[PDB]
DNA sequence: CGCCGCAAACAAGTTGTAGAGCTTATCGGCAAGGAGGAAGGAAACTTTATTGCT
DNA sequence: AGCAATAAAGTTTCCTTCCTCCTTGCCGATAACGAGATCAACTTGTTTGCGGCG
């Protein structure tokens, strides 16, 4: 929890690959009815 | 507001000038506005809405 | 009938009546503005109204 | 594009062209719907598309026209890709139109309105049916954070309610008795006190100590009542 | 005084010719470089000012900066550049929430400031 | 249920036990300050004049 | 928000003159007021000359101002602010007393905070020919070239400088500027 | 209206208003920057902390009050990595410095 | 965070369309030929094969046409952001800083002295972030969760959303839609229509109506963006993270 | 160089005050499927209760 | 009191199972109507920067 300072940097891609856990594909979220993802 | 006619004039607007410039709009109860109006240098300009 | 109902429940003017005294009605009944659709704002309008 | 044959691509592609602005004035009465209605641009995209897979598969010896034989897939390319947007089912919307036609028409047959068991005779189905429907079709999607009327007030995000709450003190004397499970069941036969600590303390498994003496949990049955019976010698509310 | 942290840059040899700068740095180089360190490469300076609102934004820090006014600005000019705040203001707490740098925890403060020194 | 003994208790409590009160707006650090409680049978804050 | 103070002393060298504001009529602000918690820049004097009452710097309470105010001195100059040096922050003896305790302010305190609240605060209430001497003093012009006039008397050929009543003491009664070339009857 | 304890949100997890809804009472910036002028640290800390979101403080220093204990431990404001997660979404290496 | 991979790049705006653009005020080109290029109005060299034509040169398509059954191999001009990319990319920092700073020498008026300076300093911070130039582009875009854009029902079996969402999907439709058209190879003006509103679907995204004019729902209203969560007083500090909500409190 | 025009962009605070919709109009048949669905039931299996023996 | 037996009862599993429904994808048959706009905004406003713009 504990840091000490903040620092910005620029988003290389692979970065994003590495924050990502898998990639999505298609609109939807849910069924209309079942409540569901 | 009316619909008609309108005249006003601003008082500096490029206020390096210190002019005056004077304009009319009209303003249809229904339909498209309209604009006339001066430059600082004393010729005619139009724009619609 | 979705237009007559909708301003009739959607504009700002339809407004509940305020039921609390003779006064409020009356009165809140004869009361005017310059708002709404063909009209003004506060931030925008000044002191010269 | 092209093909392995090239003047077959070139006509092919005049064609592609030519038939353009019949795309574009098809698609300029399909206006004032969902916002989309309001790109066209989509929709253009659509078409050519469609165009292409129609024209791939022209057939030729028919002798109908090839603006004909387009049509079908513009259309519905078209139908498609609102398809796509919408995530309702389909016989659902059948049902919404046919409503729609039957009311109206059932409404200039009276002349006035509001009488549902019109609605049933007509649609001699049965009353549940549309009643039902009436939920199923005719309650839309709303968004989250429209203000809140007499000028920005709050929001639609302050007015909001949940059931599935945190609550510290349930958990708390949960485990409170789970230690008076303990309390109670250490001095008691070695199994029992074994197969409910390890099936309700790391959520294992029961029976798989059934399985492991072999007693066919006739005793197990019974252990487990007795068991309730010291713990009906307690006192606690939460009831 | 606070109106008053940039000036504008006479000679050269330690840095650009010109460019705007504190004058507080500019005063640290040169109680530096000036110094025995050198007789002179490093510069001498005019004395700037700037109206608040500009002179605000125009910090090392960025948060703060980012904190009310035109902050998407600052944020690119920043972020182009890998810059990083340092936790010295009072918002650069009360955001990240630690305590003060002043007060009632400025001991602990100070005390994190030596740890900081100490590792 | 309210028993006598829960005020006597709250008499206990809140004797030294001071309190932050507010105005609004906080123009200047005296529109809030650090009293000391007194109970009272209301609804209502009662206030030393001066301030 | 960034100010506080830093240090206790930082050592630092010279500042301002207060000189009081008097203008236009009579004392708008006492000198006292203007020292009333100052720090003096450096040992200062008394007008029976070699007199000196801090050793370059004292808290100037209510003592100091009254043992001044039996004298006549015009002018003194502060460790301001301005010329405090340290390095992300300041001393406590260039700014002195907190007001509200009384006291020199001691190390630890936040300052522009203190500032922009205190001003801010009334702000909302607040939008809400011949040049003629009244009573006798001396007569103080500096930095003039002048001219006697034909006439005999004096007119002014350096647009600085600036008619002033002085006391028969030597403190400035009053002060008024006279044209380039004005016409004067003394 | 008073208020001890009830209802949060639910995205950000922190107090609500309106006496209809059991409401928390707001501290603004302008009450800030007076208790910054008396210079108060662990004053606003708290109640920034353990008041509005710190979830782990609200509950441990409840817990610590029943036990008679006047005691304090801080954290994170969640609302902050919310902010870094819109600030990377927004396509950026935005990131801290360990100590 | 998930994440989406994109066919092809697309650029950022607050890059861009701001006050300095830190992109052409690199290059030293305008706002306006750039536009053009990846509104697809207009293409551009990358590098002449022949020095008969020049590096950044603009090409309208049609003067285009004479060069282009001129010499047809020896020259290379495109149209987008892979053309953009690749220029990007080509570029050394260090020799035109030291040419810079070299003739800065010469004649330091004033006007030309601040913009030297201004690139210099650019591509001294390219340098010592660092960065790379080359990822202003955006090829691959993260995911946000969805606590932070949910979806709830309310009483009478109705809903409530976040309209990101929304947005999200026209972006996945379009791209799967360019994907399924380069499986047939198809004529290319479709592909540029394609990708045109595919940028326009990515700066929507990101901040509405800002470069073109805003999208809305039925109600005539924006489809409120990202940036409006950082913003004015609504935006997390002003309302949410300074001014607080607080129990063990009362009036 | 010194206009000129254009474009950006801030606009008190905290309470409360009640409730939300829709201009809409959006193939149509076939198939094949794959999920689901219900049936009533079989069947481990589990659980109770009533008499036997240490 | 501890220990088991026989009988009865309710099951959960659970698994098929064949009825029925339901949803994902495709392709089709007469012929031609028009390049949108569509219902909005009312011009805050002063200061400041930069591109032209001479
Ligand atoms: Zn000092």
């Known amino acids: 929890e504990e840091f000490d300072a903040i620092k910005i940097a620029l988003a290389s891609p692979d970065m994003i690959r590495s924050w990502s856990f898998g990639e999505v594909k298609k609109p939807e979220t849910i069924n209309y009815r079942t409540f569901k993802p | 507001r009316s619909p008609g006619v309108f005249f006003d004039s601003d008082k500096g607007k490029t206020h390096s000038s210190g002019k005056v410039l004077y304009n009319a709009r009209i303003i249809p109860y229904r339909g498209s506005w309209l604009d006339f109006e001066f430059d600082p240098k004393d010729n005619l300009f139009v724009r619609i809405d | 009938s979705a237009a007559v109902k909708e301003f009739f429940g959607s504009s700002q003017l339809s407004q509940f009546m305020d039921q609390n005294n003779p006064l409020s009605e009356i009165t809140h009944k004869r009361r005017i503005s310059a708002l709404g659709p063909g009209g003004l704002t506060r931030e925008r309008a000044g002191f010269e109204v | 594009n092209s093909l392995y044959t090239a003047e077959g691509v070139m006509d092919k592609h005049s064609l592609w062209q030519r038939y353009v602005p019949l795309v574009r004035h098809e698609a300029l009465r399909l206006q004032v719907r969902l916002p989309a209605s309001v790109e066209l641009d989509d929709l253009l995209q659509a078409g050519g598309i469609g165009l292409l897979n129609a024209v791939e598969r022209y057939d030729a010896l028919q002798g109908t026209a090839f603006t004909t034989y387009a049509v079908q897939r513009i259309r519905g390319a078209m139908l498609d890709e609102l398809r796509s947007r919408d995530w309702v089912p389909r016989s659902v919307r059948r049902n919404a139109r046919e409503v729609a036609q039957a009311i109206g028409q059932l409404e200039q047959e009276l002349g006035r309105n509001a009488t549902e068991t019109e609605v049933a005779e007509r649609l001699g189905i049965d009353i549940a049916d549309y009643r039902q429907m009436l939920l199923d079709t005719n309650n839309s999607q709303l968004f989250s954070y429209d ?32 230690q008076r499970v303990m309390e109670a069941i250490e001095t008691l036969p070695e199994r029992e006190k074994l197969v409910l600590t390890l099936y309700y303390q790391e959520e294992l498994n029961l029976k798989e100590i059934g399985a492991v003496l072999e007693v066919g949990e006739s005793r197990v049955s019974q252990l487990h009542s007795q068991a309730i019976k010291r713990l009906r010698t307690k006192l606690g509310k939460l009831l | 005084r606070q109106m008053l942290r940039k000036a504008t840059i006479v000679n050269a040899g330690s840095s650009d010719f010109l460019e705007g700068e504190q004058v507080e740095y500019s ?64 918002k650069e707490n009360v955001i990240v929430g630690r305590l003060i740098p002043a007060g009632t925890g400025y001991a602990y403060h100070q005390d994190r400031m030596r740890r900081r020194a100490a590792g | 249920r309210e028993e006598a003994v829960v005020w006597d208790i709250l008499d206990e409590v809140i004797r030294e036990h001071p ?27 009662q206030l030393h004049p001066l301030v | 928000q960034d100010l506080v ?119 909302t209430q607040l939008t809400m020919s011949s040049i003629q001497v009244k009573n006798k003093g001396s007569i103080k012009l500096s930095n003039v070239k002048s001219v006697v006039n034909s006439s005999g008397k004096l007119v002014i050929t350096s647009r600085n400088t600036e008619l002033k009543l002085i006391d028969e003491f030597g403190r400035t009664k009053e002060s008024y500027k006279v044209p380039y070339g004005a016409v004067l009857a003394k | 209206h008073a208020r001890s304890t009830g209802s949060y949100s639910l995205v950000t997890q922190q107090p609500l208003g309106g006496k209809a809804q059991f409401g928390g009472q707001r501290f603004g910036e302008m009450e800030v920057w007076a208790l910054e002028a008396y210079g108060a640290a662990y004053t606003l800390q708290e109640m920034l902390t353990v008041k509005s979101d710190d979830v782990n403080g609200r509950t441990k220093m409840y817990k610590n009050i029943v036990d008679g204990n006047h005691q304090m431990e801080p954290g994170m404001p969640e609302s902050f990595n919310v902010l870094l997660k819109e600030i990377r979404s927004l396509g950026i290496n935005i990131e801290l410095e360990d100590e | 965070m998930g994440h989406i991979e994109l066919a092809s790049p697309t650029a950022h705006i607050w890059f861009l369309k701001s006050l300095p653009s830190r992109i052409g005020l690199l290059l030293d080109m305008p706002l306006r030929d750039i536009e053009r290029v990846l509104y697809f109005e207009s293409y551009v060299v990358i590098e002449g094969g022949m020095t008969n034509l020049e590096r950044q040169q603009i090409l309208t398509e049609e003067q285009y046409l004479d060069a282009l059954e001129e010499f047809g191999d020896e020259f290379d001009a495109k149209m987008g952001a892979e053309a953009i990319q690749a220029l990007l990319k080509s570029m050394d920092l260090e020799q035109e800083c030291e040419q ?116 809305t729902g039925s109600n005539k209203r924006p489809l409120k963006s990202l940036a409006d969560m950082i913003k004015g007083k609504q935006g997390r500090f002003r309302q949410n993270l300074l001014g607080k909500r607080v129990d063990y409190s009362g009036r």
């Open chain 4, 147 to 178: 203000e809140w009327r007499e000028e920005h007030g709050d929001s639609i995000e302050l007015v909001t309610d949940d059931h599935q709450r945190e609550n510290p003190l349930q958990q708390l004397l949960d485990s409170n008795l789970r």
């Open chain 5, 27 to 90: 005063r640290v180089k040169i109680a530096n470089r000036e110094l025995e360190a050198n007789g002179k490469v490093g510069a001498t300076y005019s004395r700037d000012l700037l109206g608040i609102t500009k002179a605000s934004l125009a910090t090392e820090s960025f948060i703060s900066a980012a904190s009310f006014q035109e902050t998407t600005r600052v944020l690119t000019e920043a972020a182009v550049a890998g810059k990083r705040d340092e936790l010295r203001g009072l």
């Open chain 6, 19 to 45: 309190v932050l009160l507010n105005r609004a707006p906080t123009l200047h650090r005296l529109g809030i300050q650090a009293f000391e409680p007194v109970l009272i049978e209301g609804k209502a804050i």
């Open chain 7, 5 to 123: 103070v830093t240090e206790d002393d930082c050592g630092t060298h010279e500042g301002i003159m207060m000189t009081p504001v008097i203008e236009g009529g009579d004392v708008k602000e006492p000198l006292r007021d203007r020292v009333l918690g100052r720090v003096t820049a450096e040992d200062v004097l008394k007008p029976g000359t070699a007199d000196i009452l801090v050793p370059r710097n004292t808290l100037l309470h209510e003592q100091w101002c009254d043992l001044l105010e039996e004298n006549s001195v015009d002018a003194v100059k502060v460790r301001s602010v301005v010329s405090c040096d340290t390095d992300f922050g300041v001393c406590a003896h260039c700014y002195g007393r907190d007001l509200a305790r009384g006291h020199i302010i001691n190390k630890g305190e936040a300052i522009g905070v203190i500032a922009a609240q205190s001003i801010g605060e009334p702000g």
């Open chain 9, 100 to 215: 810079l700073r070299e003739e800065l020498n010469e004649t330091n008026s004033e006007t030309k002295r601040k913009k030297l300076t201004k690139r210099i300093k650019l591509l001294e911070a390219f340098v010592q972030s660092g960065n790379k130039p080359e990822w202003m582009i955006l090829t691959v875009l993260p995911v946000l969760p969805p606590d932070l854009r949910p979806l709830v029902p309310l009483d009478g079996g109705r809903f409530a959303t976040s309209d990101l969402n929304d947005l999200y999907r026209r972006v996945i439709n379009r791209n799967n839609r360019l994907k399924r058209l380069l499986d047939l190879a198809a004529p290319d003006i479709i592909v540029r229509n394609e990708k045109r509103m595919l940028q326009e679907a990515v700066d929507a995204l990101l901040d509405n109506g800002r470069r073109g004019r805003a999208i």
